[PDB]
Scaffold this active site. Structure first.
Site, PDB file in Angstrom:
ATOM      1  N   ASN A 241      33.107 -12.726   6.752  1.00 23.05           N
ATOM      2  CA  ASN A 241      33.163 -13.080   8.166  1.00 23.05           C
ATOM      3  C   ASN A 241      33.330 -14.595   8.288  1.00 23.05           C
ATOM      4  O   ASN A 241      33.197 -15.342   7.312  1.00 23.05           O
ATOM      5  CB  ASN A 241      31.895 -12.577   8.885  1.00 23.05           C
ATOM      6  CG  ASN A 241      32.058 -12.442  10.402  1.00 23.05           C
ATOM      7  OD1 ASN A 241      33.129 -12.684  10.976  1.00 23.05           O
ATOM      8  ND2 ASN A 241      30.979 -12.029  11.062  1.00 23.05           N
TER       9      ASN A 241
ATOM     10  N   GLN B  28      34.099 -20.299  12.528  1.00 21.96           N
ATOM     11  CA  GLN B  28      35.136 -20.539  13.530  1.00 21.96           C
ATOM     12  C   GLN B  28      34.591 -21.199  14.788  1.00 21.96           C
ATOM     13  O   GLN B  28      35.380 -21.724  15.576  1.00 21.96           O
ATOM     14  CB  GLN B  28      35.821 -19.226  13.912  1.00 21.96           C
ATOM     15  CG  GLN B  28      34.900 -18.264  14.673  1.00 21.96           C
ATOM     16  CD  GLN B  28      35.534 -16.913  14.917  1.00 21.96           C
ATOM     17  OE1 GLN B  28      35.520 -16.036  14.052  1.00 21.96           O
ATOM     18  NE2 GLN B  28      36.097 -16.733  16.117  1.00 21.96           N
TER      19      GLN B  28
ATOM     20  N   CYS C 225      39.490 -16.164  15.011  1.00 21.53           N
ATOM     21  CA  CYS C 225      39.196 -15.289  13.870  1.00 21.53           C
ATOM     22  C   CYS C 225      40.460 -14.779  13.178  1.00 21.53           C
ATOM     23  O   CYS C 225      40.489 -14.643  11.956  1.00 21.53           O
ATOM     24  CB  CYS C 225      38.339 -14.094  14.299  1.00 21.53           C
ATOM     25  SG  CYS C 225      38.857 -13.379  15.866  1.00 21.53           S
TER      26      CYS C 225
END
Length: 212
Positions: free
Chosen positions: A175, A19, A25
């Site tokens: 993630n 990101q 996120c």
């Protein structure tokens, strides 16, 4: 539900993303769950647009943060474009859906996992990837390199991610910090500690898309 789940092995998870500095996120988290449920329901793995949610979710705050639930509602009400059609730029811009042609995919709604309930979250993960939140501000999480992460961490959640599997002692998390962080971009977070918040507050706020 089985003792191990790993949606990567079912071909339902796209490559790990980064990101960047933008607080997007929440959009990355939502997109993981859309990519997963479309593969589960249709057999095809595609990448969808985080940038579209960043630009177009009027309930969220662009790079200043946002809500996975409202990003998922946007996909159920309207739809979402392919990532290639609407690639990631790392800055909020005007919503450009109406100039990029018909949507690529659409869902039928959004559900919340009962919060503060480990078994409820595992049940949802057994069925599809789930958007979850956690406290990522601590240096221990920032510097994680591998293994089953136990903290230290508090429960002041600040970071949206996606749960894509689990095992007897952990929940498997995709993630959005690139492939060089953690276990090629993933973290396994300890479960079964009896803390109703979850390690790092992992059970605070979990949502998934519904697709008939």
């Amino acid at each position: 539900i089985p003792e191990y789940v790993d949606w990567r092995q079912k071909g339902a998870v796209t490559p790990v993303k980064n990101q960047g500095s933008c607080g997007s996120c929440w959009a990355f988290s939502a997109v993981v769950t859309i990519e997963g449920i479309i593969k589960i329901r249709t057999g095809n793995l595609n990448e969808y647009s985080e940038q579209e949610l960043l630009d177009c979710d009027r309930r969220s705050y662009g790079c200043n943060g946002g809500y996975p639930w409202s990003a998922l509602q946007l996909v159920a009400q309207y739809g979402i474009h392919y990532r290639n059609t609407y690639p990631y730029e790392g800055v909020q811009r005007y919503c450009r859906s109406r100039e990029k042609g018909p949507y690529a995919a659409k869902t039928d709604g959004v559900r919340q996992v009962q919060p503060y309930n480990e078994g409820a979250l595992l049940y949802s993960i057994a069925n599809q990837p789930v958007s979850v939140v956690l406290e990522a501000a601590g240096k221990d999480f920032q510097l994680y390199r591998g293994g089953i992460f136990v903290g230290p961490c508090g429960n002041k959640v600040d970071h949206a991610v996606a749960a894509v599997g689990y095992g007897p002692n952990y929940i498997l998390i995709k993630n959005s910090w690139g492939t060089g962080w953690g276990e090629n971009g993933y973290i396994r977070i300890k479960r079964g500690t009896g803390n109703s918040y979850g390690v790092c507050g992992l059970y605070t706020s979990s949502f998934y898309p519904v697709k008939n």
